[PDB]
Subunit: 289 residues, 6 copies
Amino acid sequence: MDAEGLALLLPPVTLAALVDSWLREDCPGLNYAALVSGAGPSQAALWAKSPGVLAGQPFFDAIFTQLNCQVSWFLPEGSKLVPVARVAEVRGPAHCLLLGERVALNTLARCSGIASAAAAAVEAARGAGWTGHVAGTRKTTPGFRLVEKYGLLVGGAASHRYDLGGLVMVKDNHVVAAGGVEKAVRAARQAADFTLKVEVECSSLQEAVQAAEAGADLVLLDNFKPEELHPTATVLKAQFPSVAVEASGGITLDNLPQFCGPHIDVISMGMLTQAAPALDFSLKLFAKE
Amino acid sequence: MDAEGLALLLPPVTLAALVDSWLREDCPGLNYAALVSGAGPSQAALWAKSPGVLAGQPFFDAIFTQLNCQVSWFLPEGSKLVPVARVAEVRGPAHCLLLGERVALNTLARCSGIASAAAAAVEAARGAGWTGHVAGTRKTTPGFRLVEKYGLLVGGAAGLVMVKDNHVVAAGGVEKAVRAARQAVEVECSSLQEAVQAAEAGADLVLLDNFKPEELHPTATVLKAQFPSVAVEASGGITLDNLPQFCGPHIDVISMGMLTQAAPALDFSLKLFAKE
Amino acid sequence: MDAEGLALLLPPVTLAALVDSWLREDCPGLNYAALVSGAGPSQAALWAKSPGVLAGQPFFDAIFTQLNCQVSWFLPEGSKLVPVARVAEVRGPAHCLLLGERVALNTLARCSGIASAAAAAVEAARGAGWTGHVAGTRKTTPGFRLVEKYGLLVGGAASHRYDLGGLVMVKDNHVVAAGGVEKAVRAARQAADFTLKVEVECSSLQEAVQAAEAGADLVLLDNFKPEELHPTATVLKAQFPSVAVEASGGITLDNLPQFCGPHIDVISMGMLTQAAPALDFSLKLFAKE
Amino acid sequence: MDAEGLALLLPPVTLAALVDSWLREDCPGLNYAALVSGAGPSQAALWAKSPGVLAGQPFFDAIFTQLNCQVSWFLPEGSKLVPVARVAEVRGPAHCLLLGERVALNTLARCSGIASAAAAAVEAARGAGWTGHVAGTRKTTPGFRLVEKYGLLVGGAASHRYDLGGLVMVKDNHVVAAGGVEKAVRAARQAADFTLKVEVECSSLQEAVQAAEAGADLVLLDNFKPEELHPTATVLKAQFPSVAVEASGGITLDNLPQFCGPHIDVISMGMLTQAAPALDFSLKLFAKE
Amino acid sequence: MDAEGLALLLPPVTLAALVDSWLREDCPGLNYAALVSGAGPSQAALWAKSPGVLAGQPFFDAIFTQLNCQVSWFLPEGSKLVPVARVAEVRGPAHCLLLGERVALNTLARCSGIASAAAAAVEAARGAGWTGHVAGTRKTTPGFRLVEKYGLLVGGAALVMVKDNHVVAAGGVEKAVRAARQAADFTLKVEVECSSLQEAVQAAEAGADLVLLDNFKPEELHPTATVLKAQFPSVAVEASGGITLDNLPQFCGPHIDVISMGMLTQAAPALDFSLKLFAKE
Amino acid sequence: MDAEGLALLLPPVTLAALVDSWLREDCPGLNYAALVSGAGPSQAALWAKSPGVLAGQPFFDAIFTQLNCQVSWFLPEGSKLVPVARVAEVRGPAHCLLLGERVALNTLARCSGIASAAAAAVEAARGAGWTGHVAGTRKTTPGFRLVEKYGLLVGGAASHRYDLGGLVMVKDNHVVAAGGVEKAVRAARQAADFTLKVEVECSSLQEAVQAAEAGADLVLLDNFKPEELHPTATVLKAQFPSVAVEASGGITLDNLPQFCGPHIDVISMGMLTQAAPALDFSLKLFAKE
């Protein structure tokens, strides 16, 4: 919960190995920019030039540690950013400093952007007194999910149980191939041999209702209109009481009030990751000394 | 250059290693959802719900190929997409189709989204009467460059070693630095004197960063009059809105950051439609 | 649950990568024995010389497929093996068959041995009238996790709330790090508001009660003797019906009925993976000219 | 032979990549446990709750060194383990200690179980006055051979010719493929212009003699009963005194004295790796911060 | 051209990953040789027993650093070696020292044998008055590109290339280069292999920066390029194929700008090095 | 022996991984060259422009089999090549065929040059009435070791003595680390309970006689002039043991006959892999129907 203790969430080995691949991706051969740089001791200042939330310090750190550079932060992880802010200093050999600059900035930029979009969107949820949770989707970038998931958590959103946990989602496609929703749900509880929580993706009011009577614990109301969403939700908590309702599909920071309803527990926003602009950063080398 | 023959731009072996990496990332553990759906033959339709350019077919196929699934495309690669269009059909064992579903869609969503974004950058520069080429930057998602650069290519967007303004500060002076790269270029700048100096001891290109449109053409003018051999690039704060203001009589390339940093993904989905 | 339908659980790409690394581990140099054997087409019989459950056909297949060989099974995945049974036939070039013999047999032997031990434990507990569930532990051979999980499943063992990823496991060591159970459970609940499955591992009746009071959804009773376990479960279910009681530590196939009890939900057995002797299989050719 | 220089056998870079992959397998995603425990400096005690031999210090060390943790040993590698013995201390940040607990414990359990089984068998053949040597087999767990070979050696089992120097192993499948042992052994020697060591697996006294008259250097007497094993080895040693006699198949620690004999050189026991119970070890924190 | 800052060309993380697979390749199983030697602190001397250019220091250092050993270099990267020269000292446990020997000596041998041959050819072409660059090719050992590309660089050697087979597969020397600029967008340069002047003027017409004239004989090669550098001035012309240390003067000419030789990587003897333990603890 | 069936020695999964890494190294980024050629069914012919021995078909095939192309060979593996020779043709999509050109040619060139140099050295030493064997060494290119060791075998040099000869090598760096050849040879023997051959590497006549007195089976005479080698070798007969003599050190084709002597049993030439010029091959497209 506390934004700063969350650095402890990232597993050191797979994070080291994930930063290793990125470094390899970007310089596959001889680095001629080093020959201009020299290997003289140097320093750079990291300027944040965008409003938002700051997230991604552990990835930033690990990248420069791999190049045996050191980094000193003046804002914590989760600080509000007010443009043109000194956030950090980086020290090490010039050529290693400039090797790690792209990857590092690029990583911080998008991580912060997704924390920033997430923060905005939870401030919109409390704005309309809504007392459910804002969540992300699995609509992440192949190869980059550790970073994006961390951003959502920093900016206050939540990883869906999809990998924050494990709930056996049934998508319509599951429903289609299983032969209807009832079949797919006992096949969903066939496997897990305990009080499981099963969730169904539902595109229409009829689908939602069959799913609940089939005994699902969450109903996902996908790509509904606010007009038809709340009537659908109200019935399904007159159906069963423990059935949570989740809303995804076409939800944006502006029109999110329209989805915050008396009768929705969760809102998943695909744009937290698919549409979030990257925060603007730059690493300007200050002195050589 | 064919709207649809650039799928050949990808080396097959590196593609399968990239795909394989993505798939093991997604489902390390056992796949219980496979039991829900079973292994019966199946088909799904790829639907495009956004406007834009289509991009990333080769990654899409390599995913499903690695899973023993075949793919029929109904549009060329790089064709335009007007919403709720049927883009393709994917066939194979139900559980293998669902296994590839999100890596494929998330991949195709971001590739198209960048290509879409490039296309708008070149169409506004084409329409605002300007010669040259619109390029991307290196502001890419780590571990995802191959996808993102292919996406620029398909969208119509645009050597030696580049020298940003930190190699200059590190090597001491622009005059000493240009040398330093040539001893074995796009020098960066924040002033006019620095852009004139940039071409010395033999330099070949320039890149102006975070300049107002009004302040750049008097810089730009004096370079065809310095040594006409060097091109001039504009960079920084170029967006879809403010694109014509940065096009100039003496601006050869315009590389923007927001075609990859601020380019929303396109809405796709994949529905199964008949199952036996 | 349907035993041939269990093959569907192995993710194909990581199954292929796993098989590939085994073969590389086993023959990285020059294969001189191929000179003795030639490449002529051949056929071999798989013989089961041990009693138990057959488990591991998907690994066996994959191994021989990367060697361009073909397997026909006579028993389905999950069968009871009655010693000296002709279980399968393997067709391909002589040298490719012998190249896969060792990794294939060692894989099949170790998986089946785990399924044989699990099936015997599921039925020992069945036989005593216990409606709880036998599960396996996380005490697995590093690198062989996927095979060993699959073996448990073919034999009837269960899968835990973990792996599914919807459970924070606070062990004794976490308690001590956190200052005690009450603080430990609260930090665990604050990992994220919404995935409230906290299991607390406990070594005394008092420790279980505090965990139950602090809001623990499961209680792992560790290394209790049967005459300590049963009273402890009985009072916990008397005062905390919604908490689930899982017992582990010290359980064998011999004493397992002693550990069944009407208030034990899950018995997880380390021996299933840590002392499950491997079954005996062999693979012989029967024509080559 | 002396068990503490045995650690010198492990190649550092291969060992590190092995430990690196095991860790990645065990925690590929976010580590919510860490927030419960924090990152304060801690100390855990390694307890040995089972009788046997203690093998695996190099793997246990490498696991924790990659998590920037330290180990102090109180017992040398190889030393006998008397139940409930305090065998090591591990110092580090709390969450890093618990990140390594499971893999380190599971690795040490297996390696020690195998060394324990080897040592019990080595000693049973020494009390019985046998001049021969007990060995393991290639019947290891895939991807884990490095630990299991090491376990065998610390327990006192011997190396084969596939370990030191070369060997062509003509298994009974190779006899059938070449069509005859004379044809199989002479194909084997064709693998080099220099003197080879060729071992033929034999299932009967007939095949043993045919193997020896064929120029076999070693003879693996697979699965004889002791009534046939001793006349066979007595014949071989008399009339082919240069031939080495190895026995394997169906050997147990109980019947091992029946397979000893003055003309058996080596006894490869498969159970040493497929029916060797892991030792029970635990890692308990004993203060934090 | 820098002299000893060329160590900085090599990207550190790619380097340790590469050295890593070299060590896992050489030592898959158990290390029985360590029981002979032990782990006592010790010290070894690197000997150069061959004349030539010394190249490969970053690889040598990387290999032994991975084994927790230390290296002291007595000669800078790029020196000429005259034999029996004492070039370095390596420090660390006895078993870790010998663990790195075979992959350390092999890498150095190849790297410095290829720098040697680059120097020998750079000199020979210099002795013929020729003022253009001597480059290597891509006929490298597979998996070893980085080490060989660095070797040539230490030795003094040096866009999209349309080989003869892209002329055939496109269907004309002419259409290949314009389908080459097609999606290249002015971003990359175009070089084209040719076996006659017909072909050469075609590719220069169509705006190809460089012409490579493959397997011409020196009579034929020199009037070719004179004629060619005239019609289109800015087209740099390269000759290659069948070029050796000895016949290199016959391939140097007023109008050749680059000479690629495949001997420089496919026929570059390794240098003789050795690593002997001394004055032990 | 039979060079045609030594393809059997190559393990298929290791071959495939090796070939993948080379393909990865050769095409790191986009292949714009592929746009010029296209993906139409075409074919090329493989031209041996150089004389020698043909070796390396399995790596050639494997490369093009990874790329979805097929190879028909007109000469068997191991055949003396006469230049102006058409050796094979290859069919596939154009861009794929040209994607495999470079790596296939470089590999076949280097393998065949190593084999050609080995065949030369074997024939030359037969021509001098010498009956020892020519062998290669482990001076092999890292990452390429398999191809070089194979080529050696194809051309008739032993590359596998330390894989198959029951042989263990005691370098003179061991002798020094162990302090005297007396204990180097004793430690080398300690590791095995079976008799093994020990080869000691000597730089002088003193070192040689001490190694034979120590019990060495082979003595490697390293870097002797021919002038000092053969007196040294004749003298060791003083031992008269089945003590073999091996010569090594700068033995090239141009000086090999001077090292052939009646008291030299093995000659190992590092230049067969360090200084073996590569054969000239080209792969030219002809028709595109």
